[PDB]
Structures are given as structure tokens and as C-alpha cells.
């Protein structure tokens, strides 16, 4: 599924990401936009044997199990295929764990490079929330 910006914002709000650990909802929408272009089926297969999965491009070395990645930790305790669903619940739950595991949003390279320091409220401007 490819989400709309406002539709994703509302979905993420319903799942409790607005101001989760001090990060406003627009940070999360911005991250998704630049990680996956709002596509729940996005996959990026890396040369280090890991794969990045779904709307937030969560990596199979530390966070989910795809059975093919060396040094797998599976800290979200989920199969990576759960991150490819049209329902974003698994991806949000795992994103919450990534921040809970001592990382801020700098765990997402697209957030660090394309959202940090910008006017992230623009990502939810005009949306019904």
C-alpha cells in the first residue's frame, strides 16, 4: 500500500506516536516519506547481508528476523515479513522499541539527513487529526 501523508499521520497518531519519547508526529511522517516514500512494501537488500523492511525501513540485523542475516538479534521479536503488511501496527511497535532501546530517531538515516532541523510540522499541516 502507498499511504497519503495525511492518512499516514492519522494512522500513526492512532498508534500513539505523536510525542512518543519527545518526537512530534511530523518527525515520524517525515521519516517515512524519505525512508520508503510511504510504501509499506518497500525493501532494500544490502550488500552486508541485511535487508531494510517496510514503511520505516527497519533493518534485519538488529530488529527483525528474516533467517538470512548474519549476527541477527531480533530485538523487536518479529519476523521481518510482519513489517511488509498494509497495516502499520508491527512497524510502529518495532519503531517504538528502537527508540526504547537507547536510540533516538538518528537510528533512521533519512530522518537524520532530511528531517532533523527542518520544519517537520509541515508534514502534518492541513491534515484532519
Curated annotation (Swiss-Prot):
It is an enzyme of class 3 (hydrolase). The active site is at 35, 52. It is found in: Secreted. One of its GO terms (biological process) is defense response to Gram-positive bacterium. It comes from the Eukaryota. InterPro entries: Glyco_hydro_22, Glyco_hydro_22_CS, Glyco_hydro_22_lys, Lysozyme-like_dom_sf. GO terms for molecular function: beta-N-acetylglucosaminidase activity; identical protein binding; lysozyme activity. Gene3D superfamilies: 1.10.530.10. Residues 1-129 form the C-type lysozyme domain. In the egg white and polymorphonuclear leukocytes. Pfam families: Lys. Its EC number is 3.2.1.17. The keyword Isomerase does not apply. Keywords: Allergen, Antimicrobial, Bacteriolytic enzyme, Disulfide bond, Glycosidase, Hydrolase, Secreted, Signal. One of its GO terms (cellular component) is endoplasmic reticulum. SUPFAM superfamilies: Lysozyme-like (SSF53955). Disulfide bonds join 6-127, 30-115, 64-80, 76-94. The keyword Hydrolase applies. PANTHER family: LYSOZYME C (PTHR11407:SF28). Monomer. Belongs to the glycosyl hydrolase 22 family. This is Lysozyme C. The lineage of its organism: Eukaryota, Metazoa, Chordata, Craniata, Vertebrata.
Amino acid at each position: 500500500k502507498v499511504f497519503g501523508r495525511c492518512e499516514l499521520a492519522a494512522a500513526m497518531k492512532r498508534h500513539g506516536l505523536d510525542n512518543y519519547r519527545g518526537y512530534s508526529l511530523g518527525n515520524w511522517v517525515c521519516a517515512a516519506k524519505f525512508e520508503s516514500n510511504f510504501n509499506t512494501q518497500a525493501t532494500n537488500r544490502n550488500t552486508d547481508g541485511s535487508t531494510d523492511y517496510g514503511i520505516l525501513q527497519i533493518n534485519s540485523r538488529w530488529w527483525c528476523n528474516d533467517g538470512r542475516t548474519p549476527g541477527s538479534r531480533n530485538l523487536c521479536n518479529i519476523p521481518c515479513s510482519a513489517l511488509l503488511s498494509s497495516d502499520i501496527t508491527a512497524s510502529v511497535n518495532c519503531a517504538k522499541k528502537i527508540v526504547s532501546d537507547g536510540n533516538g530517531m538518528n537510528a533512521w538515516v533519512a530522518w537524520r539527513n532530511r528531517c532533523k532541523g527542518t520544519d517537520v510540522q509541515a508534514w502534518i499541516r492541513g491534515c484532519r487529526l
